[PDB]
Amino acid sequence: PLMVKVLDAVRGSPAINVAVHVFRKWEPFASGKTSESGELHGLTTEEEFVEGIYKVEIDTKSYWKALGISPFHEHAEVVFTARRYTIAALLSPYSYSTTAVVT
Amino acid sequence: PLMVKVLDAVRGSPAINVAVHVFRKWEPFASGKTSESGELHGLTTEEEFVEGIYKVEIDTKSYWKALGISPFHEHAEVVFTARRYTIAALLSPYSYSTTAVVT
Amino acid sequence: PLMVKVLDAVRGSPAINVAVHVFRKAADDTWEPFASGKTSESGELHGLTTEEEFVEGIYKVEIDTKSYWKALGISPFHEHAEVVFTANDSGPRRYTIAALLSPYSYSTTAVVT
Amino acid sequence: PLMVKVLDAVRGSPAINVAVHVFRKAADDTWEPFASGKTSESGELHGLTTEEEFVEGIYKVEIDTKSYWKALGISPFHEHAEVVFTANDSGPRRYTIAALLSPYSYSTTAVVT
Ligand SMILES: Cc1[nH]nc(N)c1-c1ccccc1
Ligand SMILES: Cc1[nH]nc(N)c1-c1ccccc1
Numbered sequence: 001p002l003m004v005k006v007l008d009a010v011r012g013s014p015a016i017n018v019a020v021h022v023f024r025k026w027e028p029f030a031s032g033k034t035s036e037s038g039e040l041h042g043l044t045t046e047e048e049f050v051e052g053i054y055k056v057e058i059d060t061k062s063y064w065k066a067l068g069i070s071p072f073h074e075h076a077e078v079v080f081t082a083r084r085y086t087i088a089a090l091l092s093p094y095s096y097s098t099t100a101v102v103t
Numbered sequence: 104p105l106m107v108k109v110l111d112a113v114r115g116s117p118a119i120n121v122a123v124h125v126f127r128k129w130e131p132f133a134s135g136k137t138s139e140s141g142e143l144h145g146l147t148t149e150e151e152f153v154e155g156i157y158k159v160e161i162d163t164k165s166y167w168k169a170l171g172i173s174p175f176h177e178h179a180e181v182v183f184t185a186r187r188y189t190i191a192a193l194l195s196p197y198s199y200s201t202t203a204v205v206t
Numbered sequence: 207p208l209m210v211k212v213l214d215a216v217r218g219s220p221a222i223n224v225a226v227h228v229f230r231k232a233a234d235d236t237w238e239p240f241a242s243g244k245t246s247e248s249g250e251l252h253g254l255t256t257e258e259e260f261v262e263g264i265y266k267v268e269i270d271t272k273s274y275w276k277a278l279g280i281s282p283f284h285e286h287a288e289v290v291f292t293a294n295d296s297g298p299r300r301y302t303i304a305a306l307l308s309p310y311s312y313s314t315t316a317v318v319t
Numbered sequence: 320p321l322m323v324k325v326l327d328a329v330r331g332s333p334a335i336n337v338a339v340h341v342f343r344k345a346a347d348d349t350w351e352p353f354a355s356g357k358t359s360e361s362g363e364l365h366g367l368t369t370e371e372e373f374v375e376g377i378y379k380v381e382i383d384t385k386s387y388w389k390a391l392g393i394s395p396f397h398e399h400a401e402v403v404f405t406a407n408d409s410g411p412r413r414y415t416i417a418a419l420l421s422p423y424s425y426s427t428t429a430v431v432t
């Protein structure tokens with residue numbers, strides 16, 4: 001029911017091995033690291049993911065430090081009210097954009 | 104070797120049935136319409152897609168008119184020098200962002 | 207030293223009368239309220255803070271995009287847009303945080319001078 | 320009536336000395352050169368045109384992002400960033416085209432007042 005996809009706008013690549021944490025209003029409850037394709041599947045389950053207010057926190061700063069690229073943000077976080085949901089993020093050192101795809 | 108993916112930032116959805124045209128420096132040579140997932144596969148072939156300068160033109164204005172949403176841009180176009188390439192676009196009525204994923 | 211600018215990608219306009227809340231991380235690792243304000247008719251919020259107040263630290267700027275969209279009559283996806291960043295670590299700088307809003311997306315960038 | 324603002328998402332800065340070319344679609348459906356300039360130290364390009372010159376029509380603003388990135392020593396993906404839009408169709412308006420640049424991406428929005 002919830003997937004994250006992270007892309008790198010500097011290198012033109014998926015953002016790989018990025019830490020992602022999910023919280024519900026903040027109680028952490030799901031987290032993982034992006035795969036080779038920049039995607040993080042299997043965070044949660046249909047049973048667990050109830051309506052409510054969620055935060056997806058992506059650890060952009062350690063991703064940029066692993067690349068030797070100087071970052072601005074501590075993270076990127078995405079807070080929304082809750083179908084399948086994809087939270088997509090496109091990362092640059094001093095900016096990020098995020099959209100939700102709800103199908 | 105070349106795929107396009109289009110997302111809608113107003114509705115939170117893939118952008119479906121959007122016309123996409125590809126040109127090589129401008130000679131048109133590949134075009135199609137996005138699927139239900141907002142993706143357009145099979146534009147070209149490994150043999151056809153040589154190094155050079157390309158333009159991907161996405162017909163955003165007819166997509167926004169089909170939705171009853173007033174657009175700004177005539178289109179979105181993406182011009183680059185040429186692996187597999189994904190051109191991703193995220194659409195709003197008065198803005199668009201585009202990135203390339205090169206794997 | 208800190209300004210915030212907010213634009214609407216649906217209407218092609220400045221995002222007016224948007225609430226912006228700033229917090230600073232405190233020593234016990236909670237967020238301390240630091241400054242707030244609302245965007246003007248140009249979508250800009252100036253006068254949040256002063257050179258004297260704005261010390262080094264980790265800040266959170268939270269833009270209330272939910273109430274902006276509901277005041278337009280639209281049901282948005284996100285509760286707010288934000289940036290969390292470390293400020294002034296090599297001395298004072300001037301930071302502009304710009305945010306571009308749509309119902310299901312936003313982007314934000316920082317300009318540091 | 321037309322301004323362009325360009326920001327760098329890598330450096331967190333204005334994109335200075337960026338070339339911007341404006342074209343207008345002519346009656347035979349070719350692009351006619353309309354105006355050009357370079358961004359200032361604030362990343363802004365003012366004085367492109369005048370109310371009198373800027374009539375209704377379909378414009379293309381082409382931002383030379385390739386030479387910006389190569390002058391920084393970086394090999395970018397896109398040749399340029401752009402917008403193509405119909406201007407002044409219900410009378411004069413003021414248009415700001417803003418663009419945010421990274422080596423493999425860009426976004427652009429329009430603010431119309
Ligand atoms: C192109 C763009 N800008 N901002 C974004 N989140 C995206 C995007 C990210 C992943 C997939 C498709 C689009
Ligand atoms: C925050 C953002 N995302 N995409 C953009 N073009 C912007 C923007 C760029 C220049 C000036 C102001 C905002």
Ligand SMILES: [Ca+2]
Binds near residue numbers: 029030031
């Ligand atoms: Ca769990």
Ligand SMILES: [Ca+2]
Binds near residue numbers: 132133134
């Ligand atoms: Ca063909």
Ligand SMILES: [Ca+2]
Binds near residue numbers: 262294296297
């Ligand atoms: Ca310090």
Ligand SMILES: [Ca+2]
Binds near residue numbers: 375407409410
């Ligand atoms: Ca007219």
